Amino acid sequence: GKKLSDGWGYRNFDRGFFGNTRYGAEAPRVCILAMGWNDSSASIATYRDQIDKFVRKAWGYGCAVGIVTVNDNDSVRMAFELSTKKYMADKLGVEYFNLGPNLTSASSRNEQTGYYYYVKKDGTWDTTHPQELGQMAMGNAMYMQTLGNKYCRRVRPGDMLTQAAVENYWDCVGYPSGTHYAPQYVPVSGAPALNVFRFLSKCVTNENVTMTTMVWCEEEGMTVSLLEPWTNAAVVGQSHNIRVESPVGKALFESGEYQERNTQINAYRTVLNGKTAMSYFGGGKTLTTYMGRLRKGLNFIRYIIDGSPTDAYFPMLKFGSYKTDGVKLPMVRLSKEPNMTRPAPVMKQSNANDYGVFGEVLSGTQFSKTADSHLYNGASVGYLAVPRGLKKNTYIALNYNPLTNVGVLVGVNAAGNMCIGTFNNANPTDWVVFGDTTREDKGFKVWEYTSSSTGAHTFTVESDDGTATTSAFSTTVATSGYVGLYNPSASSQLFTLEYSMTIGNVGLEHHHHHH
Amino acid sequence: STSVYDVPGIVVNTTTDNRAAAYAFPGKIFIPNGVTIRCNLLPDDDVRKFVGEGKLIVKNQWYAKDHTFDIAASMNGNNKTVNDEIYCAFRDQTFCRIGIIGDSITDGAWGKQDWSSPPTNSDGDLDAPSTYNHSLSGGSHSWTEHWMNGLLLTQSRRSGETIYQSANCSVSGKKLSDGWGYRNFDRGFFGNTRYGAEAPRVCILAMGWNDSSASIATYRDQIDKFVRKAWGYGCAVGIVTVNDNDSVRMAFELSTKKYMADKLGVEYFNLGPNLTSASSRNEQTGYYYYVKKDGTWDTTHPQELGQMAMGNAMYMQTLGNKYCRRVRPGDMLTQAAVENYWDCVGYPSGTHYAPQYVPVSGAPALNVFRFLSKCVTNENVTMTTMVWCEEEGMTVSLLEPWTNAAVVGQSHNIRVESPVGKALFESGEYQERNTQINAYRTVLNGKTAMSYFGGGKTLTTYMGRLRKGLNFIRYIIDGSPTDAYFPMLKFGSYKTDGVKLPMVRLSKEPNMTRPAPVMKQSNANDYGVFGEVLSGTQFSKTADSHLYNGASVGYLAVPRGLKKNTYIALNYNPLTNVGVLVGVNAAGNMCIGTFNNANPTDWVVFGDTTREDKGFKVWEYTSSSTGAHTFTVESDDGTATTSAFSTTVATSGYVGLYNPSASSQLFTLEYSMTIGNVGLEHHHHHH
Ligand SMILES: [Cl-]
Ligand SMILES: [Cl-]
Ligand SMILES: [Cl-]
Ligand SMILES: [Cl-]
Ligand SMILES: [Cl-]
Ligand SMILES: [Cl-]
Known part of the structure; x- marks a missing residue:
């Protein structure tokens, strides 16, 4: 309720700083003039003179003076503030600050923030005196326009x-x-x-x-x-x-x-x-x-x-x-050379673009890497599709890390069964084998989930004909990496696949029974 | 300088015209604070003749009228600001005449193909006395008038009164190095009664392009001369560069107009960058912005869209800064x-x-x-x-x-x-x-x-x-x-x-009476009204209608079908509990209907009774006539199809799952909403 046009801010400079021993009973090292809203009926000339008076008192007592506009939510006040506080800041050569823009950003994030920022406890609308989040957003702007400028x-x-x-x-x-x-x-x-x-x-x-x-x-x-x-x-x-x-x-x-x-x-x-x-x-x-x-x-x-x-x-x-x-690998069809002993990523970038540790984690491309865990686990879904199946002794690699040579293998073994296992810098010793021995060139999907309890990456594999399924594979070792191909067979072979990792936030279940 | 009291021929009053005496005297003249003399200055007279803090009474050469020249403001600046005046006029609702002194580009070429210059006499100067208004004539579509348009559209939010008006004294082929802009300041503003026959509240110096053969020093001095005349007569002075399309001119403009703006302490504006943006949007805009009616190339005098883009920049650098x-x-x-x-x-x-x-x-x-x-x-x-x-x-x-x-x-x-x-x-x-x-x-x-x-x-x-x-x-x-x-x-x-839900496989609990979204965010991120409409994610919401309807395609795929009494929800609004259901009913038929805060009473049932665990697709379209969302459902085996369902109630929402059955069940699906613009058809016959 106090005004600069009244002379209140000029008078209470003394009373507020000199008269308060907790405030040091002295002029403060920094002095901020933050008034403005109350005085809009006063002349521009009147208000300019009051700012001049205030600044020179503060100058004389040793203060580093700043002038701040705190709110932009009134049409007429914005213009008034510009013609007085912004005007005098430039003319006197003192730093000027506006917290308004950031208040506008924070408060206009969506259709509900208007409530959180401008609705009082009595259910009335007030854009002049913002609620708790508004006061924070203003302070944040002031921080950015000070130390935040170099330290944030x-x-x-x-x-x-x-x-x-x-x-x-x-x-x-x-x-x-x-x-x-x-x-x-x-x-x-x-x-x-x-x-x-x-x-x-x-x-x-x-x-x-x-x-x-x-x-x-x-x-x-x-x-x-x-x-x-x-x-x-x-x-x-x-x-x-x-x-x-x-x-x-x-x-x-x-x-x-x-x-x-x-x-x-x-x-x-x-x-x-x-x-x-x-x-x-x-x-x-x-x-x-x-x-x-x-x-x-x-x-x-x-x-x-x-x-x-x-x-x-x-x-x-x-x-x-x-x-x-996320990770987004559209349908791709490519051949791979025979007699490999190491999986290879389906889609590579230059090493300068990505050296495989952090740079492309869930970046949402055909080049992207999965993450080991989420803050919100058990809510995301990895999805692999191999529509035309695979040849014997041929596998797709999931979460493959070329740096550590570690990832998950899924495909058709030499005997013609489906299988899934951990490629731990060597061929798997933990193979999970399932389905009949006729899985060659028959399509399947793979679904990947995470546990919010253990962080484990659990896999469900299902052939398209419905005959071969397993969810009996889980890993806490091959938890992140890229999509890759593995052809340890003695002949060059074609691989057709797509992969997508979709991020979720609310936990989801994925269990059913044999009935 | 010499004190005015010591100069031959000067009479210190308000009635004697001291002009002849003052400029017969070869040196500078000092007039102290509080002292006024009459000096009927002619437009070519260098006002830097006078120093000190006194005032001149200057007769209008075209109307029975006097003008005050403030020497103190001329010498020290008047501390006025273009933005200050413009924002002040918005707040005070007072009149704000904005004058511009410029060349061809600001004259209005080529803001409209029938552009023409302000009338000029046989000497090449602006006609005076005059009732000419350029904004209502050949310069009706100069960047200045597009600038005014933005101001007036901002003003419209307070009042219908027209407080922002231009006085565009810009003529093609004229130069600042000639002294033309300095002279025609007087003739343009004092000599035009439609422009108020006075100094304008805002004065913009927009010249520059013509003068590139003149020295940097020469041009700086001309800017100094111009600004101090305008200062002395009470104008809030701004300096503007309008075009950046010439390599050498950019450097010249920087060394003169930008340089002097900073040194004199007057606001500087550059419209160039936005012209460059607008004109470089694609491979065709170069034609729209720089090709003249005679099919020749001109990046100096932009076409209609170029003139607008420049005005838009000027608006952004003025009222637009806080009001846009x-x-x-x-x-x-x-x-x-x-x-x-x-x-x-x-x-x-x-x-x-x-x-x-x-x-x-x-x-x-x-x-x-x-x-x-x-x-x-x-x-x-x-x-x-x-x-x-x-x-x-x-x-x-x-x-x-x-x-x-x-x-x-x-x-x-x-x-x-x-x-x-x-x-x-x-x-x-x-x-x-x-x-x-x-x-x-x-x-x-x-x-x-x-x-x-x-x-x-x-x-x-x-x-x-x-x-x-x-x-x-x-x-x-x-x-x-x-x-x-x-x-x-x-x-x-x-x-x-758009909406993009990749393939997902998840189970849902039995005995639900309410559909639930497949993918949720936090309520702080989206509370389900507007925030995620067509945002293009697995969380996104569809829209009720498009400006361009009947051009977009919703697509649902359920590759492994569904169990009996189990359904996918489309356009489901969890706030109003309203959406479309599609799936397999208890009898084993396909069905589609409206979940209107309750199980549907408008079920569309089709296909045989063996639809359990058999794949289908769903295609969603919109009518540009009714806005209705029409659905086509087709089983993968080709046996079960219908397009007999349409809604104007469940028109937007999220993808959801519905399991009212007595057992927990798996749901496998993907969904995508693709936005189009040109209308598309989707009908075929049974033949
Ligand atoms: Cl208050
Ligand atoms: Cl007031
Ligand atoms: Cl100066
Ligand atoms: Cl004539
Ligand atoms: Cl010109
Ligand atoms: Cl020249």
Whole structure:
């Protein structure tokens, strides 16, 4: 209810800063003039003079002065603010800020956000005084226009946050010591993926850590994936997890009079949450976790490592879009050379484009790689179709990792049965054999699911004639990779197939009985 | 400088014309603060003769009138700003005459094929005295007037009053190096009573192209001279580069006009980039933008679409900056702060209505909105907005959030034009060319879903592709409505729009009484009204209708068929519990029907009684006549077919599964909705 035209802001500069010993009883190092909305009946000239008066008082007392417009939701106020606060900021040579645009973005995400941003507890409409999420979106804009400008990366689909200059973007606080650790760059080798990295960044903590970062999404519909580049001495079951909040701010108090409303809004802010792949598969690995959708504007990312680790490595983040993420291999028909001892990807890119660790995880192409796990597992569906079947001793490879030479095989063995197994840097020793011995050149489908309990990739194979089926194969070893072909037979053979990995969020069931 | 009191021949009063004495004196003249003299300056007289903080009384050479020249403003700048004046005029609702001094491009070539220059005398200068208005004549379709169009369309959201008007004093072949722009400042503005016979509130210097043989230093000095004259007479000065299509001119413009704009502290504008975008959209736009009526190539004087694209850039760099949203695929324009982006003019009253925010409920979609914006009109309305597309290949969808008391058949329609401007005159000598170019501008047009399905509903309409740059969106509501609600707009891409559900195999629980979507997102991501309409994913929703209906194809495949009393749901709306069912009934026949918040009472049953676990496809089409969604079902063995099902009730929703049987069952399916534009037929005979 206070106005700049009244002289209230000018007077209470003294009373507010000099008169408050908790505020230091002195001029503040930074002084922000944020008034404007109340005064629209006052002349442009009048208001300009009041701004001049205010700025020079603050200048004289040693303050670094800024001027900020906080809201853009009123047609006339926008023009007024431009002619006074923006005008005087330029003329006086003081920094100008507008939080309005980001409020508009956050509040206009869909058909429901208008409620969350502008509807008061008494059920009335107010775009002048935004609700909790609105106040956060404004603060987020102010952060981006200050420290965020150099310390927060602006991202679009296709971008990656790597292990380089992590100290710019990440912190690493230990629990319970509360130590803020400093990143180190160490050379890594002795495993194919590490030889790709050459160097990773880490902290030596010997305790649980919380690694946080922020990114600014330039577009709606964006997504994020997690790379845990070296799971060192981790043990399966530890509570490693990750969480994304957007918009960002001081969390509402989960207590008091408005505990329910506050819990509701915080939950709404939390757009992603769950266990990482490391929690499923343990140490000595390099693992990828699909997470899901982000929000336009500022996103807060909190990453927890459990089990009191000696070394804690910073993760990398890959950004995509929910409109294109997945794996999409349209129908292809191609021959492969005989006497192979190693599966080969159906569709390759240049090594400069993808060296097979993280860059093409669920990127949604004919070149894409699956992920080891999802934040929301047991909700996605891998699908392979081999319409004209396969020759004997000929197989399709699923989740094949050319770097580690590990993947799943499915096809027709020498005896003419269907079979599925784990190619673990050698021909499988865990073959699951099924159906009659006449499976050559007969079509089948393969469906892949994941367990939200174990992280295991479970496979169901069904011949088109309905005679040969199995779901008896499951793996926690060949959990991600590319589609490949394998021809260990003595003759060149044709392979016809398509593959698609569809991402889901709500868990789905896929069981039926023999009846 | 010399003090004015020491200069021979000067008389310090307000009546004696000190002009002859002042310019007979060879040096500069200092007039102190608070002191005014009469100096009847002639248009060629260098106003930099005077320094200090005094004032001149300057007689109008064409009307019985005087003008004040402020030397302090001329010497130090007046701190006025083009944007400041334009935004101030919007807020204060005061008149804002915008004057432009320029050359051929700004004159209006080739904004319309019958373009002509302002009248000029035998000396080559603007006629004065004058009642000429270029905007109503040969320069009616210059980029300046398209710029005005954008301003006036933004102004329309407050009032019907025409506060933005141009004074385009631009003549082809004229130069700044000659001193022509400096001289004709006076003649153009003072000498024209239709232009107010005074300095304009805004003054734009748009010259540049002609002068490339003149020195950088020479040209800088001419800009300095011009700006200070305009400063002294009270103008908010801007400098604009209009074209970027010449390699050498770009560098020249940077070293003079951009350079001096920064040094003098006046706003700088470049319309070039947007011209480049619009003109480089594809392999054919080069013709539309740069080929003259005589079949020759000219990238210096763009055609009609080029002039509009330039004006659009100028609008974006002025009022458009706060009053036009910049969009990319994924963005939505909602019901919040519509007054910033929309107007609402009634017909025939011509009233400009003000938006109201009212609480809504009593229907699932309204409970999602909680609040909508509307106008109470009791008459037909036209709602217009503009958006700026940051990318090529973008699309738009329409949401009509509450169709209130609408009746089926009313002519509600929507139209998109891009680039934007004053429409070419559909008459005269170039009626055919003009009609052609306007049609080309109009990138989308057609009936809305409300026109098909009527009142008491919430409806979505897919529209189609937009253009990079400024897009004009006009929305008409017919049938004299009491309430008119503002629509929301969702933006996508033509490369990804549709519905795409790859092959999925999943089981569902027995004894359901409600279909359930195959693939869900979080409620925060999509609450099922508008956010995922044709977004092109496994989560996406279909639309009730298209601007271009009867051109798209829904496709469902159920390769391994279905168990008895088990169905796939199409267009299922979980909010209203409404959708289409197709599958195998308890008797073992195929069937299709409308699940209207209950099991269907309109079942269409066909085929023999052995359809269990036998594959079928389903094809969905729309009528451009009725808006109805018509279905064709065909079993893979060819024995069971029907096209006898049609709905105007279950017109949009998600893919779902329905298992009312007593056992858990597997469902294998894929679905795709492909958007088309040219209408297609899909009928065959039993022969
Ligand atoms: Cl207030
Ligand atoms: Cl006020
Ligand atoms: Cl100056
Ligand atoms: Cl004459
Ligand atoms: Cl010219
Ligand atoms: Cl020249």
